[PDB]
């Protein structure tokens, strides 16, 4: 039932998911001048060399690339995290125009898109259990700005025509998520939530300071996706982003000076 439209979008979500008005909702505006540098934060450990991608799916709200998370093959550790978090999937949020599309904002600036790499804490054994825990998930967020192409994104771009409408999926093996990462792993971190229903308050957010650049042609391909199933009226999958939510007694910490 939920979506991103006038009648089912973010301002409606609290009726089905009352935690939408909770104390640790995401995304937020990152006020860079208010974030405190924390010299106790470790460098983030991103160990993606043995990642095994499986499939790409249009889920009606975004598209997602799924990984084999049955072993410790692609894991996030360190930074603000205690323990080991397995990569489950990545997906994106994007706009109808290049000046909107990100969920997090940086001093109110919106990027054209935002990549989310979703990981779950192995101490909970499975993602469904993990979303019921306050430290269940770690989502690595990466901003996309429009300029030069990101060569590592092209394999994703090129298969989107095969998953246009909701419910379509394809095999998507040997995709290397290292090709989506910026140079620097400098980050902001704070405790928050899933940014889509069920909006569970289970996420340690790790948002990288450095955006990746993608080309206009790459982002245009995202915007050709459809929210609708084949057979329903065509509605472009654009503006699939939740706006910034109240910070409410949280501190955002910076890994860098």
Q: Using CB under 5 A as the criterion, which residues of the chain lie in contact with Zn ion when the complex forms?
A: 116
Specify the residue, 9 or 38, whose C-beta has the smaller distance to Zn ion: 9
Which residue is associated with the tokens 């104390």?
Answer: 23
Known catalytic residue: 33? Answer: no
Map residue 128 onto helix, strand or coil: helix
Task: Supply φ then ψ for residue 75, to 5 degrees.
Answer: -130, 150
Closest CA to 61 of 252, 227, 197, 238: 227
Least distance from C-beta 57 to Zn ion, angstroms?
A: 14
Closer Cβ to Zn ion, 116 or 150, answer by number? 116
User: In terms of C-beta density within 10 A (0-12 exposed, 13-18 middle, 19 or more buried), how is residue 255 classed?
Assistant: buried
Q: Provide, rounded to whole angstroms, the least separation between the CB of residue 93 and Zn ion.
A: 6
Flag whether 91 is marked binding. Answer: yes
Our CB check for Zn ion shows the closer of 8 and 38 to be 8
The verdict on whether residue 93 carries a ligand-binding annotation is yes
CB of 91 to Zn ion, least distance (A): 6
Residue 66 assigned as binding residue? no
Got the DSSP string for 178-204? Answer: GGG--S---EEEEEE--SSTT--S-EE
Q: Which is nearer to Zn ion, 172 or 205 (CB)?
A: 205
d(Cα 232, Cα 53) in Å, to the nearest integer?
Answer: 30
Catalytic residue among 14, 61, 104, 119: 61
CB of 194 to Zn ion, least distance (A): 8
Annotated binding site: 91, 93, 116, 195-196
Active site residues: 61
């Amino acid at each position: 039932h939920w979506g991103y439209g006038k009648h089912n979008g973010p301002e409606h979500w609290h009726k089905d998911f009352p935690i939408a008005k909770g104390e640790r909702q995401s995304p937020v505006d990152i006020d860079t001048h208010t974030a405190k540098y924390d010299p106790s934060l470790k460098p983030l450990s991103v160990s993606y060399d043995q990642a095994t991608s499986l499939r790409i799916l249009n889920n009606g709200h975004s598209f997602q690339v799924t990984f084999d998370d049955s072993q410790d093959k692609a894991v996030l550790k360190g930074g603000p995290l205690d323990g080991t978090y397995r990569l489950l999937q990545f997906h994106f949020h994007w706009g109808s125009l290049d000046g909107q599309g990100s969920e997090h904002t940086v001093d109110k600036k919106k990027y054209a898109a935002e990549l989310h790499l979703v990981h779950w804490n192995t101490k909970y054994g499975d993602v469904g259990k993990a979303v019921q825990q306050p430290d269940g998930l770690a989502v690595l967020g990466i901003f996309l700005k429009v300029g030069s192409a990101k060569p590592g994104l092209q394999k994703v771009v090129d298969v989107l025509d095969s998953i246009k409408t909701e419910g379509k999926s394809a095999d998507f093996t040997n995709f290397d998520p290292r090709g989506l990462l910026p140079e620097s792993l400098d980050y902001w971190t704070y405790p928050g939530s899933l940014t889509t229903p069920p909006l569970a308050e289970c996420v340690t957010w790790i948002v990288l300071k450095e955006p990746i650049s993608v080309s206009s042609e790459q982002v245009l391909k995202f915007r050709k996706l459809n929210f609708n199933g084949e057979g329903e009226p065509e509605e472009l999958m654009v503006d699939n982003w939740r706006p910034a939510q109240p910070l409410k007694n949280r501190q955002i910490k910076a890994s860098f000076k």
